[PDB]
Design a protein around this ligand. Structure first.
Ligand SMILES: Nc1ncnc2c1ncn2[C@@H]1O[C@H](COP(=O)(O)OP(=O)(O)O)[C@@H](O)[C@H]1O
Ligand SMILES: [Mg+2]
Ligand SMILES: [Mg+2]
Ligand code: NA
Length: 158
């Protein structure tokens, strides 16, 4: 749908952009879980942007990618946020087993790395975040996939 292209000159800027993006997702206050697919090569900054989003809205503590556990649950001032790294998801099937269930059926926010691995089982994304990189700079394209995605992108305006 609508798109945003945003230059991120350095890591501080990535963290500031995560805080602004996560603040928009909280303020929208949706009943449906917000699906965010974080895309980009290894080292592009998907986990650093996730860190800026969670720490930016108040998480205190390390943001450890869930390499083997696949999903990490956060409770931030009462909002449930789920960070997924699906790289080691053998088959999407394994998803219907683990606790995924309740996470996609409540007023949560889900931030997903390697969403391709979950094709079929994972709910469709509301917004894709495609991160490109050069040295210590980045550029992110946000792409809306749903009506909610469109509303998220419109919120970035001035
Ligand atoms: N502008 C920037 N944005 C994000 N990460 C940056 C930036 N500049 C440098 N980095 C570095 O790049 C790495 C990003 O790694 P990570 O967030 O784990 O990536 P991914 O999850 O996509 O594999 C970190 O070591 C980080 O400090
Ligand atoms: Mg990738
Ligand atoms: Mg990562
Ligand atoms: Na993804």
């Amino acid at each position: 749908m609508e798109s945003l292209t945003q230059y991120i000159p350095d890591e501080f800027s990535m963290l500031r952009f995560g805080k602004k993006f996560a603040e928009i997702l909280l303020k929208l206050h949706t009943e449906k879980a917000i699906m965010v697919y974080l895309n980009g090569d290894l080292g592009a900054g998907k986990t650093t942007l996730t860190r800026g989003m969670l720490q930016g809205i108040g998480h205190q503590g390390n943001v450890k990618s869930p390499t083997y556990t696949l999903v990490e649950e956060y409770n931030i001032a009462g909002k449930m946020i789920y960070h997924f790294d699906l790289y080691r998801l053998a088959d999407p099937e394994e998803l219907e087993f683990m606790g995924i269930r309740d996470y996609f059926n409540t007023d949560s926010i889900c931030l997903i790395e390697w969403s391709e691995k979950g094709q079929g089982i994972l709910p469709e994304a509301d917004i894709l975040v495609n991160i490109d990189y050069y040295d210590d700079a980045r550029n992110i394209e946000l792409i809306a996939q749903t009506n909610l995605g469109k509303n998220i992108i419109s919120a970035f305006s001035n």
